Structure formats: C-alpha cells, structure tokens
Tab-separated table of N, CA and C and ligand atoms in Angstrom:
chain	number	residue	atom	x	y	z
A	1	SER	N	0.877	-1.299	0.148
A	1	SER	CA	0.029	0.017	0.301
A	1	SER	C	1.124	1.391	-0.336
A	2	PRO	N	1.779	1.316	-1.257
A	2	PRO	CA	2.902	2.766	-0.928
A	2	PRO	C	1.812	3.799	-1.228
A	3	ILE	N	0.875	4.031	-1.983
A	3	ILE	CA	-0.187	4.850	-2.091
A	3	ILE	C	-0.998	5.251	-1.226
A	4	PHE	N	-1.295	6.405	-0.765
A	4	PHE	CA	-2.196	6.446	0.369
A	4	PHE	C	-3.006	7.584	0.028
A	5	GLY	N	-4.766	7.324	0.386
A	5	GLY	CA	-5.771	8.429	-0.036
A	5	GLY	C	-6.618	8.625	1.358
A	6	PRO	N	-8.369	8.797	0.521
A	6	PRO	CA	-9.144	8.552	1.416
A	6	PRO	C	-9.933	7.171	1.013
A	7	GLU	N	-9.846	6.273	1.794
A	7	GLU	CA	-10.605	5.148	1.437
A	7	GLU	C	-12.052	5.448	1.303
A	8	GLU	N	-12.853	6.089	1.991
A	8	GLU	CA	-14.192	6.061	1.935
A	8	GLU	C	-14.274	7.971	1.666
A	9	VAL	N	-15.329	8.315	0.484
A	9	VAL	CA	-15.306	9.887	0.894
A	9	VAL	C	-16.966	10.150	0.308
A	10	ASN	N	-17.822	10.859	1.160
A	10	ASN	CA	-19.012	11.105	1.274
A	10	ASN	C	-18.973	12.651	0.895
A	11	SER	N	-20.117	12.640	0.067
A	11	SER	CA	-20.741	14.121	-0.236
A	11	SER	C	-22.242	14.131	-0.633
A	12	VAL	N	-22.659	15.102	-0.709
A	12	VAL	CA	-24.266	15.534	-1.116
A	12	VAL	C	-24.524	15.900	-2.504
A	13	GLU	N	-25.556	15.217	-3.291
A	13	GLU	CA	-25.427	15.805	-4.566
A	13	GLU	C	-25.787	17.095	-4.442
A	14	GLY	N	-24.948	17.703	-5.550
A	14	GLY	CA	-25.079	19.154	-5.917
A	14	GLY	C	-23.592	19.497	-5.415
A	15	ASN	N	-22.973	19.198	-4.381
A	15	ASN	CA	-21.684	19.811	-3.735
A	15	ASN	C	-20.387	19.470	-4.816
A	16	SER	N	-19.294	19.779	-4.360
A	16	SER	CA	-17.706	19.703	-5.136
A	16	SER	C	-17.305	18.813	-3.974
A	17	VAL	N	-15.993	18.128	-4.606
A	17	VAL	CA	-15.267	17.124	-3.874
A	17	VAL	C	-13.995	16.775	-4.083
A	18	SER	N	-13.235	17.051	-3.255
A	18	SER	CA	-11.884	16.936	-3.646
A	18	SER	C	-11.076	15.578	-3.039
A	19	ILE	N	-10.162	15.186	-3.822
A	19	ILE	CA	-9.699	13.955	-3.376
A	19	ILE	C	-8.233	13.829	-3.502
A	20	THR	N	-7.799	13.761	-2.457
A	20	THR	CA	-5.854	14.081	-2.254
A	20	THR	C	-5.312	12.467	-2.172
A	21	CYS	N	-4.509	12.262	-2.839
A	21	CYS	CA	-3.372	10.947	-3.010
A	21	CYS	C	-2.078	11.367	-2.899
A	22	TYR	N	-1.303	10.406	-2.078
A	22	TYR	CA	0.039	10.429	-1.475
A	22	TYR	C	0.543	9.229	-2.330
A	23	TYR	N	1.752	9.862	-2.526
A	23	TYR	CA	2.730	8.975	-3.410
A	23	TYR	C	4.274	9.264	-3.044
A	24	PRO	N	4.809	8.269	-2.810
A	24	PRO	CA	6.879	8.296	-2.492
A	24	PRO	C	6.939	9.568	-3.489
A	25	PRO	N	7.696	10.644	-2.644
A	25	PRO	CA	8.393	11.962	-3.461
A	25	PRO	C	9.226	11.414	-4.258
A	26	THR	N	9.435	10.173	-4.908
A	26	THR	CA	10.692	10.117	-6.083
A	26	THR	C	10.632	10.312	-7.188
A	27	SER	N	11.403	10.906	-7.470
A	27	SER	CA	11.766	11.550	-9.341
A	27	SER	C	10.648	10.304	-10.092
A	28	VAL	N	10.998	9.260	-10.359
A	28	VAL	CA	9.688	8.378	-11.338
A	28	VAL	C	8.608	8.729	-11.036
A	29	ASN	N	8.143	8.704	-9.631
A	29	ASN	CA	6.966	9.209	-8.894
A	29	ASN	C	6.643	10.153	-9.669
A	30	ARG	N	7.056	11.283	-9.138
A	30	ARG	CA	6.893	12.734	-9.251
A	30	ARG	C	6.566	12.777	-10.812
A	31	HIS	N	7.151	12.172	-11.439
A	31	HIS	CA	7.242	12.353	-13.284
A	31	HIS	C	6.255	11.506	-13.995
A	32	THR	N	6.182	10.326	-13.574
A	32	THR	CA	4.915	9.633	-14.195
A	32	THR	C	3.599	9.546	-14.519
A	33	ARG	N	3.149	9.252	-14.688
A	33	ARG	CA	1.411	9.509	-14.933
A	33	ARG	C	0.426	9.465	-14.047
A	34	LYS	N	-0.414	10.652	-13.645
A	34	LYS	CA	-1.046	10.721	-12.229
A	34	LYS	C	-2.632	10.562	-13.071
A	35	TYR	N	-3.150	9.271	-12.556
A	35	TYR	CA	-4.818	9.228	-13.110
A	35	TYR	C	-5.884	8.876	-12.078
A	36	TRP	N	-6.951	8.768	-12.250
A	36	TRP	CA	-8.163	8.675	-11.437
A	36	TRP	C	-9.302	8.443	-12.357
A	37	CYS	N	-9.565	6.590	-12.127
A	37	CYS	CA	-10.054	5.871	-12.682
A	37	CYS	C	-11.798	5.401	-12.197
A	38	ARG	N	-12.447	5.043	-12.580
A	38	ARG	CA	-13.621	4.740	-12.041
A	38	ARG	C	-13.626	2.605	-12.536
A	39	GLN	N	-13.712	2.208	-11.215
A	39	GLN	CA	-13.747	0.417	-11.098
A	39	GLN	C	-14.937	-0.049	-12.224
A	40	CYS	N	-11.041	-0.963	-14.818
A	40	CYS	CA	-10.773	0.744	-14.029
A	40	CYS	C	-10.857	1.725	-15.775
A	41	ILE	N	-11.861	2.452	-15.976
A	41	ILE	CA	-11.891	3.303	-16.961
A	41	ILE	C	-11.166	5.023	-16.460
A	42	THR	N	-10.184	5.597	-16.929
A	42	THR	CA	-9.713	6.606	-16.800
A	42	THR	C	-10.832	8.030	-17.077
A	43	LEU	N	-10.679	8.657	-15.913
A	43	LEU	CA	-11.949	9.766	-16.022
A	43	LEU	C	-11.052	11.148	-16.299
A	44	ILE	N	-9.746	11.325	-15.871
A	44	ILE	CA	-9.017	12.279	-15.741
A	44	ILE	C	-7.636	12.076	-15.528
A	45	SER	N	-6.564	12.338	-16.248
A	45	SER	CA	-5.285	12.242	-16.079
A	45	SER	C	-4.419	13.478	-16.165
A	46	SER	N	-3.039	12.966	-15.472
A	46	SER	CA	-1.853	14.329	-15.424
A	46	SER	C	-1.219	14.348	-17.327
A	47	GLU	N	-1.832	13.577	-17.911
A	47	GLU	CA	-1.027	13.182	-19.415
A	47	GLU	C	-2.158	14.405	-20.338
A	48	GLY	N	-3.104	14.864	-19.638
A	48	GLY	CA	-3.786	15.962	-20.861
A	48	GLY	C	-4.719	15.062	-21.315
A	49	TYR	N	-5.415	14.251	-20.621
A	49	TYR	CA	-6.605	13.385	-20.769
A	49	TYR	C	-7.608	13.880	-19.985
A	50	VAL	N	-8.837	14.146	-20.689
A	50	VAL	CA	-9.766	14.307	-19.393
A	50	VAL	C	-11.526	14.059	-20.151
A	51	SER	N	-11.869	13.072	-19.689
A	51	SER	CA	-13.026	12.311	-20.168
A	51	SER	C	-14.042	13.482	-20.465
A	52	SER	N	-15.025	12.941	-21.399
A	52	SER	CA	-16.435	14.207	-21.698
A	52	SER	C	-17.108	14.179	-20.527
A	53	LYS	N	-17.189	12.749	-19.778
A	53	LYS	CA	-18.385	13.255	-18.656
A	53	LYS	C	-17.514	14.128	-17.514
A	54	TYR	N	-16.232	14.519	-17.540
A	54	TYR	CA	-15.390	15.474	-16.400
A	54	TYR	C	-15.241	16.487	-17.296
A	55	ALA	N	-15.207	16.498	-18.383
A	55	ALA	CA	-14.436	17.806	-19.017
A	55	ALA	C	-15.126	19.286	-18.503
A	56	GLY	N	-14.406	20.040	-17.828
A	56	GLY	CA	-14.758	21.355	-17.276
A	56	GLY	C	-15.524	21.062	-15.946
A	57	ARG	N	-15.846	19.729	-15.621
A	57	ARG	CA	-16.257	19.621	-14.033
A	57	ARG	C	-15.361	18.947	-13.337
A	58	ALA	N	-14.479	18.917	-13.363
A	58	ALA	CA	-13.400	17.999	-12.803
A	58	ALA	C	-11.974	18.811	-12.780
A	59	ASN	N	-11.171	18.423	-12.088
A	59	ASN	CA	-9.408	19.220	-12.136
A	59	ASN	C	-8.761	17.806	-11.603
A	60	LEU	N	-7.569	17.921	-11.941
A	60	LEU	CA	-6.309	17.165	-11.440
A	60	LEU	C	-5.415	17.695	-11.489
A	61	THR	N	-4.654	17.512	-10.235
A	61	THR	CA	-3.341	18.870	-9.800
A	61	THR	C	-2.262	17.825	-9.411
A	62	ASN	N	-0.929	17.894	-9.763
A	62	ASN	CA	-0.002	17.067	-9.355
A	62	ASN	C	0.810	18.297	-8.415
A	63	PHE	N	1.409	17.803	-7.077
A	63	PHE	CA	2.169	18.480	-6.289
A	63	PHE	C	3.684	17.405	-6.110
A	64	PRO	N	4.057	17.631	-7.024
A	64	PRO	CA	5.563	16.486	-6.944
A	64	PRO	C	6.150	16.881	-4.963
A	65	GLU	N	6.595	18.186	-4.820
A	65	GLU	CA	7.339	18.315	-3.682
A	65	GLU	C	6.742	17.376	-2.546
A	66	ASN	N	5.243	17.908	-2.506
A	66	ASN	CA	4.542	17.224	-1.338
A	66	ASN	C	4.170	15.450	-2.037
A	67	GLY	N	4.528	15.368	-3.028
A	67	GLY	CA	4.205	13.619	-3.326
A	67	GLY	C	2.979	13.511	-3.271
A	68	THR	N	2.128	14.483	-3.682
A	68	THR	CA	0.285	14.049	-3.950
A	68	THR	C	-0.228	15.093	-4.941
A	69	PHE	N	-1.338	14.761	-5.043
A	69	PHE	CA	-2.075	15.052	-6.171
A	69	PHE	C	-3.377	14.884	-6.127
A	70	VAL	N	-4.403	16.378	-6.454
A	70	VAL	CA	-5.368	16.390	-5.864
A	70	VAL	C	-6.368	16.169	-7.321
A	71	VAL	N	-7.847	15.676	-6.961
A	71	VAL	CA	-8.939	15.250	-8.018
A	71	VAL	C	-10.240	16.160	-7.512
A	72	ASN	N	-10.404	17.355	-8.060
A	72	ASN	CA	-11.222	18.134	-7.903
A	72	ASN	C	-12.918	17.518	-8.891
A	73	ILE	N	-13.736	17.686	-7.718
A	73	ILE	CA	-14.780	17.068	-9.098
A	73	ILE	C	-16.531	17.738	-8.651
A	74	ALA	N	-16.658	18.619	-9.679
A	74	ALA	CA	-18.056	19.588	-9.118
A	74	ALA	C	-18.797	18.900	-9.533
A	75	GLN	N	-19.883	19.466	-9.119
A	75	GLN	CA	-21.966	18.927	-9.680
A	75	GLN	C	-21.541	17.670	-9.393
A	76	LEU	N	-21.376	17.058	-8.323
A	76	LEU	CA	-21.707	16.015	-8.034
A	76	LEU	C	-23.041	15.253	-8.343
A	77	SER	N	-23.411	14.167	-8.758
A	77	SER	CA	-24.674	13.447	-8.804
A	77	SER	C	-24.959	12.219	-8.234
A	78	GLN	N	-25.650	11.553	-8.770
A	78	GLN	CA	-25.688	10.307	-8.603
A	78	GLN	C	-25.382	9.384	-9.286
A	79	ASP	N	-24.791	9.585	-10.676
A	79	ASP	CA	-24.013	8.536	-11.570
A	79	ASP	C	-22.929	9.013	-10.449
A	80	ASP	N	-22.092	9.581	-9.883
A	80	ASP	CA	-21.022	9.406	-9.093
A	80	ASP	C	-20.750	8.896	-8.439
A	81	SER	N	-21.785	8.294	-7.922
A	81	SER	CA	-21.466	7.261	-6.367
A	81	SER	C	-20.880	5.972	-6.803
A	82	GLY	N	-20.052	5.379	-6.067
A	82	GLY	CA	-18.975	4.119	-6.607
A	82	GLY	C	-17.532	4.138	-6.444
A	83	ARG	N	-17.103	2.787	-7.087
A	83	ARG	CA	-15.754	2.607	-6.829
A	83	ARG	C	-14.735	3.405	-7.851
A	84	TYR	N	-13.648	3.894	-7.142
A	84	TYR	CA	-12.767	4.256	-8.163
A	84	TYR	C	-11.457	4.250	-7.650
A	85	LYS	N	-10.423	4.589	-7.897
A	85	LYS	CA	-9.057	4.206	-7.921
A	85	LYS	C	-8.155	5.583	-8.576
A	86	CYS	N	-6.862	6.204	-7.491
A	86	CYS	CA	-5.973	7.332	-7.743
A	86	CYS	C	-4.806	6.203	-8.154
A	87	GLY	N	-4.082	6.510	-9.270
A	87	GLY	CA	-2.477	6.020	-8.858
A	87	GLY	C	-1.689	6.206	-9.951
A	88	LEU	N	-0.435	5.915	-10.230
A	88	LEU	CA	0.510	6.362	-11.144
A	88	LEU	C	0.820	5.528	-11.872
A	89	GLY	N	1.369	5.822	-13.091
A	89	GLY	CA	1.643	5.066	-14.447
A	89	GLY	C	0.686	4.517	-15.290
A	90	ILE	N	0.410	3.286	-15.581
A	90	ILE	CA	-0.834	2.813	-16.576
A	90	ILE	C	-1.496	2.004	-15.178
A	91	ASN	N	-2.863	2.244	-15.785
A	91	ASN	CA	-3.767	1.579	-14.867
A	91	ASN	C	-3.884	0.110	-14.461
A	92	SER	N	-3.253	-0.702	-15.241
A	92	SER	CA	-3.201	-2.142	-15.088
A	92	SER	C	-1.873	-2.599	-14.024
A	93	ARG	N	-1.265	-1.284	-13.355
A	93	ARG	CA	0.074	-1.728	-13.168
A	93	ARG	C	-0.444	-2.084	-11.422
A	94	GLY	N	-1.360	-1.584	-11.189
A	94	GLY	CA	-1.573	-1.719	-10.162
A	94	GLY	C	-1.447	-0.569	-8.810
A	95	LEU	N	-0.122	0.204	-9.182
A	95	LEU	CA	0.272	0.865	-8.185
A	95	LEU	C	-0.481	2.124	-8.222
A	96	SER	N	-2.083	2.110	-7.292
A	96	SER	CA	-3.039	3.094	-6.887
A	96	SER	C	-3.378	2.618	-5.803
A	97	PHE	N	-4.575	3.020	-5.443
A	97	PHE	CA	-5.266	3.001	-4.143
A	97	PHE	C	-6.509	3.106	-4.508
A	98	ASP	N	-7.594	2.442	-3.372
A	98	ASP	CA	-8.987	2.445	-4.113
A	98	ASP	C	-9.725	3.317	-3.170
A	99	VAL	N	-10.563	4.357	-3.593
A	99	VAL	CA	-11.299	5.485	-3.200
A	99	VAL	C	-12.883	4.776	-3.362
A	100	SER	N	-13.735	4.651	-2.300
A	100	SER	CA	-15.113	4.960	-2.783
A	100	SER	C	-16.139	5.963	-2.580
A	101	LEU	N	-16.531	6.277	-3.357
A	101	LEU	CA	-17.117	7.482	-3.246
A	101	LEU	C	-18.877	7.747	-3.359
A	102	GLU	N	-19.190	8.157	-2.387
A	102	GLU	CA	-20.827	7.922	-1.877
A	102	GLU	C	-21.515	8.865	-1.712
A	103	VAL	N	-22.436	9.485	-3.191
A	103	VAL	CA	-22.876	10.849	-3.015
A	103	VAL	C	-24.207	10.950	-2.392
A	104	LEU	N	-24.528	11.081	-1.056
A	104	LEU	CA	-26.055	11.107	-0.425
A	104	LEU	C	-26.946	11.823	-1.313
A	105	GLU	N	-28.103	11.270	-1.507
A	105	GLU	CA	-29.231	11.910	-2.049
A	105	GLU	C	-29.548	13.858	-1.235
A	106	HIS	N	-29.786	14.301	-1.944
A	106	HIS	CA	-30.024	15.808	-1.433
A	106	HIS	C	-31.808	15.636	-1.463
A	107	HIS	N	-31.788	15.641	-0.478
A	107	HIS	CA	-33.578	15.772	0.112
A	107	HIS	C	-34.466	16.924	-0.221
A	108	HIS	N	-35.467	17.011	-0.746
A	108	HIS	CA	-35.951	18.074	-0.797
A	108	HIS	C	-36.218	19.543	0.250
A	109	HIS	N	-36.486	20.285	0.038
A	109	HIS	CA	-36.344	21.259	1.386
A	109	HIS	C	-37.940	22.126	1.884
A	110	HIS	N	-38.788	21.111	2.442
A	110	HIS	CA	-40.001	21.181	3.034
A	110	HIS	C	-39.720	21.656	4.259
A	111	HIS	N	-39.930	22.627	5.478
A	111	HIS	CA	-39.616	22.927	6.403
A	111	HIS	C	-37.998	22.834	7.193
B	201	LIG	MG1	-30.539	21.840	-0.080
C-alpha cells in the first residue's frame, strides 16, 4: 500500500469534492502519469486526458514536492457514487489506491 488516500469519501448531490492521494516523493513517481479511474476506466489524468463526462466539471493537479495530487470534482450527481482508483503510471500496473465515493441524496426542502 505505497500510495495513500481517502478509503471512503461521502458528499451530497450538488456539492464539489476533492480527493487527495499521496505517493512516495521520488523522481519516477513525481513525473510518471497520475490518474483517476472508475472501477478501471480513466476519467482524468495528468497527461492531458479528460473524459467527456468530466470535461469542465473536474480537475487533477500534481504537487511533486509534497508527493501528492488532487482531483477536484464538481456538481456531484447520483451517477458519481461508486468505486474509483487514484494511481501512478498505467492503470493495470496496480500502483494505486481504491476510493469509494458515496453521493448522499439531496432531500427536498420543506420546513
Ligand atoms: Mg439543499
């Protein structure tokens, strides 16, 4: 478990959420591709790829000195609840961490 992050993240429909994953701050790690995928299909990476579902509604930023990268996701919907992975390199390399995202429903506002 070299990489570390939030095992579980809960949010409410309509919110914005940020997910921070940590990795050894060594050169290879620092410059290798960072990715966020849904259990695993790439949704956004540090190598210029941004899926259509995420285009404009999310971001992925790398902070090498810290050995971290952050995925910001906005306007969370019921479609976003699920299992994801944040990792380095290629998806099937396994060098990742599993994150469970639960988007709690937004109840109506009476009273
Ligand atoms: Mg409300």
